Amino acid sequence: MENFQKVEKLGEGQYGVVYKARNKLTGEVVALKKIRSTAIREISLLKELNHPNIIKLLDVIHTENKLYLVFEFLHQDLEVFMKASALTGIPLPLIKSYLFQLLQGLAFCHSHRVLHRDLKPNNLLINTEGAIKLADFHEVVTLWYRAPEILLGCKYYSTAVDIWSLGCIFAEMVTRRALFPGDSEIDQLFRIFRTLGTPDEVVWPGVTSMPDYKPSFPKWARQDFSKVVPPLDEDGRSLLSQMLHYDPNKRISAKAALAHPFFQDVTKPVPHLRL
Ligand SMILES: CC(C)c1cnn2c(NCc3ccccc3)cc(NC[C@H]3CCNC[C@@H]3O)nc12
Structure with a gap:
């Protein structure tokens, strides 16, 4: 030192x-x-x-x-920027740019067999030039961005855990509210189940044989998805639904998401940062 x-x-x-x-x-x-x-x-x-x-x-x-x-060193994190932008929201072209950039970063990580595992707004770092970067590959654990297979006790995470986390962050940038703000693993799981429906073998083969799956979980029905992220257009909603599939094998890859029609008009705007 x-x-x-x-x-x-x-x-x-x-x-x-x-x-x-x-x-x-x-x-x-x-x-x-x-x-x-x-x-x-x-x-x-x-x-x-x-x-x-x-x-x-x-x-x-x-x-x-x-x-x-x-x-x-980068000058601000996305958690701080989202709080600073909460009156008006982050403009959609800047949301889209940041999502596209993070998907490029993850496609690169994943092609080198590196997972992030703990994506959250406070380890996404931004600069005045419009870039965003993946970081951090008595504090209270944040579970809000946790993929369901992690919460259900899967020992072998795949790259799909990062797509799930990034989907939760995407939703939060657009709505200005965290998608699944649980305060315990079981509250986190039930918040997901109340929004996306309690998963079963039809949507997620093998779900009932996961370490922490209990037959006695409540059976909630899937909410309508236009209700969950209302200001998002149908291309955004389509992409999000693919990032939040329960089965990690069904969940879209970073590379495939980059080709999604949501990004047809992607651009690189400048954020207003107060440093
Ligand atoms: C360690 C490395 C990844 C790093 C580079 N820039 N930077 C900034 N920069 C933003 C910033 C600037 C000035 C004051 C607060 C925050 C903040 C920061 N925060 C520490 C933790 C917080 C929790 N998430 C992981 C972060 O690395 N970690 C980092």
Whole structure:
């Protein structure tokens, strides 16, 4: 830490605390994550995962029990920007741009057999140029973006978990309200079931044999989908429904979603950021 002037705590990541910091020699402003053997080798592969829509990992330093990860610093997160934009909403062309960019990032991750696993507005980072990046591959766990197969005890996540999370974020950008704001795993699951219908073997083969599936779950009927994201046009609703299929095998892939008609008129607008 003698090599960095700390400036400000930014918050808690998945495995430790993040500081904005300045490199003493270069003047570079970076985000430094402080963590607390096979992870040393695995995070080194994460340094080679370079794409415009993925946060740049600049350095991995292992020393005195702790691991420091030095990342690119970005000026705001999407959670903050959505709160700042809640009176009027984020304009639809900017929603569309951010969704398209995140799908490019995920298509890249997934083609390199990297999953995110915990996508949420606060690990999506934005800049003044209109880019958005995937990041963070006594705090209370947020379950609102959790795919149903995770909540039902699937041991082997697939890439589809990230498409589900991104679908929940898409919905929240458009409606200005979180799609499934549960405060426990069972409340999260029942919020999903009340909106999308309690899944059965017709819509999700194998659902009843999942570790945490109980025959005794309530049987709610699927809500009408025009009721769930009203301001979204039918192309947006179609895409969303494909991102929120219960069966991960049915759920659209990032690569397939990029070809969806919702993106025919996609553009790259400038956000209004107050920094
Ligand atoms: C560690 C790396 C991924 C990183 C780069 N920029 N940046 C910003 N920037 C936005 C910002 C700027 C100024 C004040 C607050 C937030 C915030 C931030 N927050 C810390 C956690 C919060 C929970 N989600 C994961 C984040 O890395 N982590 C990062």
